[PDB]
Subunit: 188 residues, 3 copies
């Protein structure tokens, strides 16, 4: 009965902060959503098996054991959903030097079974300027638009394989409060 919701967006789009604010407002109203990050959920599982001590060591792992941890992360999130509604911060695609890599390949969706995929969007201009303010980080607006394109294709495909609705929310400067209200609204 409890919902599984995935929140995605490119670095700098502000989707993590948006979800934290939404859960706070859902809790004023008595609706508990537990927030997790899919990637540290994978890191946690790999430490459980003695596979790592360091988080940089993750992307030096073989493609098989990395496919199994992905599976255990989704199943593990599937387990938390018996005890609370779950909101998962993850990438629709990771922009890697080798190309766009789906954050939820089919073997992860079959275990996770989301009810909603959220795509958090804004203009390339607003995204690139946020990045420059972040003292912890250079790529330009065309590469940012390309990524927001490929993220859309990946989430719609997730929707075709899982049955989740795919919801696009705009997170615009001066209007972050509007993004919260629509996301609260989606989940009620």
């Amino acid at each position: 009965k409890n919902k599984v919701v995935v929140v995605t967006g490119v670095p700098g789009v502000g989707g993590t902060t948006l979800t934290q604010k939404t859960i706070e407002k859902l809790k004023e109203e008595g609706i508990e959503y537990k927030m997790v990050n899919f990637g540290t959920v994978m890191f946690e599982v790999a430490k459980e098996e003695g596979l790592v001590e360091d988080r940089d060591q993750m992307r030096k792992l073989d493609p098989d054991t990395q496919k199994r941890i992905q599976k255990l992360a989704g199943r593990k999130i599937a387990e938390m959903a018996k005890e609370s509604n779950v909101i998962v911060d993850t990438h629709s695609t990771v922009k890697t030097p080798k190309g766009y890599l789906a954050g939820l390949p089919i073997w992860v969706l079959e275990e996770l079974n989301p009810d909603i995929i959220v795509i958090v969007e804004t203009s390339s201009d607003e995204i690139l300027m946020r990045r420059l303010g972040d003292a912890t980080r250079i790529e330009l607006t065309s590469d940012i638009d390309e990524h927001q394109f490929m993220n859309r294709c990946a989430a719609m495909a997730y929707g075709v394989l899982t049955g989740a609705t795919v919801k696009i929310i705009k997170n615009r400067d001066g209007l972050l409060d509007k993004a919260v209200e629509e996301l609260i609204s989606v989940l009620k």
Copy 2:
């Protein structure tokens, strides 16, 4: 041997009237296409199995049996396909308040086995202007939202093509040029 064709489009783009026009001129040539609406096939399937008596009572059934109605609906159209070519009027994605919902999830595709996905498009301007004319719109939103829906529909239709092998055909249904779109679809089916 018979073909199963899916025709898709956002509300107001005229794909239904395009389809009915194409079906009528094809029959003049000795080609039978039966036209069905995927949403009414789901209603009919849920009635036979005792699940409902009303077409509104369906969007209050649990998502599990509602997924089974979907699976059976795709199966029923492939059954109709032993007897005629079949054209299915359906949304590539339905734009719901909760987000875009795929009109043919994989479990439907596994039974439907479509041969062609047609995406009927035009400019968001014409779509909004057609919609405003319809006094049967109090639930129809801006052109940027219309452009977004035609985007997601393309991504969903190509995924159907990747998972089924159906070719995905884009037809432009423009004001003053409706007759050209019909003729291009007739050509697609010949």
Copy 3:
């Protein structure tokens, strides 16, 4: 372990010629990639199978066996990968008169198991001027060409979701062809 790479692009973008330069420079560095054409793997598979003697007969076989040929092509390319890295030149989608046709439908991906899907792109203007120059083009517009680049993206991303292959876009721009090669050599590391 050897990697299998799919290289894609609309006609006239130069994805084929980009690959011949890259495989040629990779070997100077001691890295062997074998280049194959997915459609010629299919033709060769069917010739053993008594199904054809002529490429004329291929686009006239029944749709069950021609899916079966598709699958055996994916398997056979996956077999070549036991002995060397394999680079597969194919269409992410084929623009046919009936619409866009995926070049790696799901049943092929399950057998081919690519590691990288590469999309070669440039402006529709550059693509269209190349096409007119080629006297080996036997008519379509810049809008039709961009629509094809759009669907190829939707398909290629779909491959990554189903397989875990990375989807990489390389721009192959006029006056900057040598720049595109360097990016692809880099991809192959």
